[PDB]
Design a protein around this nucleic acid. Structure first.
Lengths: 507, 128, 171
RNA sequence: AAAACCCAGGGAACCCACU
């Protein structure tokens, strides 16, 4: 796959003398999943804009010996001539071997696609991409023998460069002598991400201590998606549920009067200012060494989006291991030690609900088989999911007893006339995802589908194939191959409110 | 190696037969019409409609009867297929222009007869 | 020149696509696989006029598909060396002239363009014109060009025109 | 560094067996 610093990162250097592109290489859909978006670099990105950006170069040459960077078929499909070179990496600069033949071949291209330019590309695009450009410019672009050697820097600034290449370049062609978003959609006043390492690491380590978590990252309990096997767990032990609403998982660590922090699935830490958590006995002293688990959800009431935090579990309360107790006891502790003191001081006017950044509440909970009523389903559309908590004590990490219940993949659609050998060439919209360049799905291409070509689109499994749910152009890249595996189970089991409601209802 | 200015052709294009811009236009229009019918058939190639529009823009004989009249008029004179097709396509108006555009017509016909042929072409040119 | 010739090509049929109607499948295959193609010997395969002959189907020994030698009338075009051809101007450049002949792009460089026929980017369309402003060759014009040479690359042919000889330029 | 070890890159001469 891709090593660290697989790419230097500046995606494309400007053309040397407005003639030769000083770029490099790979990061196709297969490597999109393991790469950051600014780092992300598809042939499409250098190209979908290129057709009208006047960046539409007609020759592409791959200098690095390894072919692991990306598939060369797309470049030919783009119409850019895909060429590859065997310039050794590891700090090897060429000496007219695989270079002089290329230079004449490159000269042959000069007119092979003339309105178009050339694309030369070494491992990082500086280790001989310039040396080859410098070599050719001296040969045909009449660039000064010493100056052409330095010309690559003008268009592709070297940054990390290779001295070994410069010495051979100088000698052969002249003289060697020369992100963290708290709540997406609504901004909350007083919530500030903490980037200071002394406090960030301290909060992370204290959360790990309070959770008793082995590894690094999020210490939280991670529920699992159900199959026909997980349903068996009814007859072994009781359960308790609340409704999963579309929100972000957050743990609040109460360490003092102003020591309130947010911890998400990415382990990022934010600081909340104006939240006050009184102690039930003395309302003047504020809670410390308290760890809560909950979700941050946007709730629209009276046409206004009110951020809310629903507390559905407690891990630590004043260093007391409440997480080791029963879940009912933990819910009662949540109630009496969190919700009641805050409302108690709110009634006296010492805590103003308007001045706090967001509301604090506890999620209501139910059970095993009975209260079927919502599956006479009145809120059948308002149900996005449901969260399953057993009666046992809290356990971090992956929990096979804690279940998560919840169209739907971005697709790199490629409409291709797949040409079978000895077969009628057949046009088909190949559907593939990041990490899976191989098309998991191939769909009959309607002319209406043919309006969108090479388009990232959300697809709804209308039939066995997924008709586009939406044009998910907003997702620049298609989702991971594993997300396709995840929906390969998710849209394979019909997962319904009538299926789980009783199951979340009785005991 | 090849030069049609003095009618040097490769051995492959010895039995070849030339066509007009209008003949090619009408053939391509008929093929487009049969493509409109006969469903479960994809669209034709880019070269297809490219040449179709190219020969529709430069069409000079709007009638198939005009095509037949031009052929029945031009075939009985001693002309090569390339020279005949080029004369009927470019449609020159002066014998000097016809001889300059096609340098292989030098002495094939008398300049007065050549001008009479050009006048006939202009007479049967479907004006727009 | 636009030519009407007979060409021989072999079509390969998998048994999966035999079907009840077999010859129509071969006709569709031929109408797809040669159309829009270009050969260095016969030029642009413009269109297939009429499928003339279908040869005997020799099944390849050991391997599954059958082989059909097919003779068919085809409309073709191949650029020549030394002929004046009508063209449509697609772009005027300080280096050359981008012209079009059907599907073929032709590049008329300025050194092969006479000295009077100068380039001016100051005009709203970048165009070629003389100092007398009589002959103005600009975007989307109908001109005539003198084909000097043709180059084939990636299975298609592009050519180079010139205006040295007399009666060359705007119609 | 797709470390897809998707699993040899040695040859020559001699001897010994089995049919």
């Amino acid at each position: 796959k891709i090593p660290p610093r697989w790419l230097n990162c500046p995606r494309r250097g400007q053309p040397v003398a407005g003639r030769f592109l000083p770029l490099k290489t790979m990061l196709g859909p297969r490597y999109d999943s393991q790469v950051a978006e600014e780092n992300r670099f598809h042939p499409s990105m250098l190209s979908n804009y290129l057709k009208s950006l006047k960046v539409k170069m007609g020759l592409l040459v791959d200098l690095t010996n390894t072919s692991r960077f990306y598939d060369r078929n797309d470049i030919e499909k783009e119409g850019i001539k895909y060429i590859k070179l065997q310039c050794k990496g590891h700090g090897e600069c060429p000496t007219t071997e695989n270079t002089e033949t290329f230079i004449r071949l490159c000269e042959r291209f000069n007119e092979r696609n003339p309105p178009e330019l050339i694309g030369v590309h070494s491992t990082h695009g500086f280790n001989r991409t310039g040396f080859l450009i410098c070599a050719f410019l001296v040969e045909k672009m009449d660039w000064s023998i010493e100056a052409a050697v330095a010309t690559f820097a003008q268009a592709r600034p070297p940054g990390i460069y290779k001295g070994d290449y410069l010495k051979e370049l100088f000698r052969r062609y002249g003289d060697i002598e020369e992100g963290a978003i708290f709540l997406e959609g609504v901004t909350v006043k007083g919530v500030t991400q903490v980037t200071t390492q002394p406090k960030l690491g301290e909060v992370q380590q204290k959360c790990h201590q309070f959770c008793g978590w082995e590894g690094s990252g999020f210490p939280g309990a991670q529920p699992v998606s159900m199959d026909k096997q997980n349903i068996k767990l009814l007859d072994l032990k009781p359960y308790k549920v609340s409704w999963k609403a579309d929100g972000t998982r957050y743990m609040m660590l109460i360490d003092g009067t102003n020591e309130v922090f947010m911890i998400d699935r990415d382990n990022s830490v934010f600081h909340v200012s104006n939240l006050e958590f009184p102690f039930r006995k003395d309302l003047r002293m504020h809670l410390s060494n308290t760890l809560l688990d909950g979700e941050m959800i946007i709730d629209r009431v009276n046409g206004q989006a009110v951020p809310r935090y629903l507390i559905y579990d407690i891990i630590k309360f004043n260093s007391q291991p409440v997480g080791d107790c029963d879940f009912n006891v933990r819910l009662q502790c949540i109630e009496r030690e969190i919700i009641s003191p805050r409302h108690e001081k709110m009634k006296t006017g010492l805590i103003d609900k308007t001045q706090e950044p967001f509301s604090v509440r506890n999620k209501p909970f139910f059970d095993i088989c009975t209260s079927r009523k919502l599956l006479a389903k009145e809120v059948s559309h308002e149900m996005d999911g449901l969260i399953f908590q057993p009666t046992g004590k809290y356990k971090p990490g992956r929990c096979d007893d804690i279940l998560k219940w919840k169209n739907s993949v971005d697709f790199r659609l490629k409409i291709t006339r797949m040409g079978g050998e000895g077969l009628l060439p057949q046009n088909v919209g190949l559907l593939y995802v990041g990490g899976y360049e191989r098309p998991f799905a191939q769909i009959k291409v309607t002319k209406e589908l043919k309006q969108y070509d090479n388009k990232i689109i959300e697809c709804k499994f209308e039939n066995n194939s997924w008709v586009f749910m939406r044009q998910r152009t907003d997702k620049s890249f298609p989702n991971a191959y594993n997300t396709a595996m995840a929906v390969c189970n998710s849209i394979s089991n019909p997962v319904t409110k009538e299926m789980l409601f009783e199951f979340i209802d009785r005991c | 190696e090849e030069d049609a200015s003095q009618l040097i052709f490769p051995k492959e294009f010895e039995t070849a037969e030339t066509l007009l811009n209008s003949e090619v236009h009408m053939l391509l229009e008929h093929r487009k019409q049969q493509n409109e019918s006969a469903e479960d058939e994809q669209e034709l190639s880019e070269v297809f409609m490219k040449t179709l529009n190219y020969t529709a823009r430069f069409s000079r004989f709007k009638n198939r009867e005009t095509i037949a009249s031009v052929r029945s008029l031009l075939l009985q004179k001693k002309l090569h297929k390339f020279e005949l097709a080029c004369l009927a396509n470019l449609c020159p108006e002066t014998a000097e222009e016809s001889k300059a555009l096609i340098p292989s017509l030098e002495g094939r016909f008398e300049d007065e007869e050549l001008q009479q042929i050009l006048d006939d072409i202009q007479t049967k040119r479907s004006f727009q | 020149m636009f030519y009407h010739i007979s060409l021989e090509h072999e079509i390969l049929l998998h048994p999966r696509y035999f079907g009840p109607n077999l010859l129509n499948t071969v006709k569709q295959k031929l109408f797809t696989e040669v159309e829009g193609t270009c050969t260095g010997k016969y030029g642009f395969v413009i269109a297939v006029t009429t499928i003339d002959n279908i040869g005997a189907g020799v099944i390849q020994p050991g391997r599954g598909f059958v082989l059909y030698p097919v003779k068919y009338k085809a409309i073709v075009f191949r650029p020549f060396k030394g002929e004046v051809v009508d063209a449509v101007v697609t772009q005027v450049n300080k280096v050359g002239l981008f012209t079009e002949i059907g599907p073929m792009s032709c590049f008329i460089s300025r050194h092969s363009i006479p000295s009077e026929m100068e380039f001016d980017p100051n005009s709203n369309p970048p165009c070629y014109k003389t100092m007398d402003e009589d002959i103005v060759i600009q975007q989307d014009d109908e001109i005539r060009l003198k084909i000097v040479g043709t180059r084939v690359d990636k299975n298609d042919i592009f050519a180079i025109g010139s205006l040295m000889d007399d009666y060359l330029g705007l119609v």
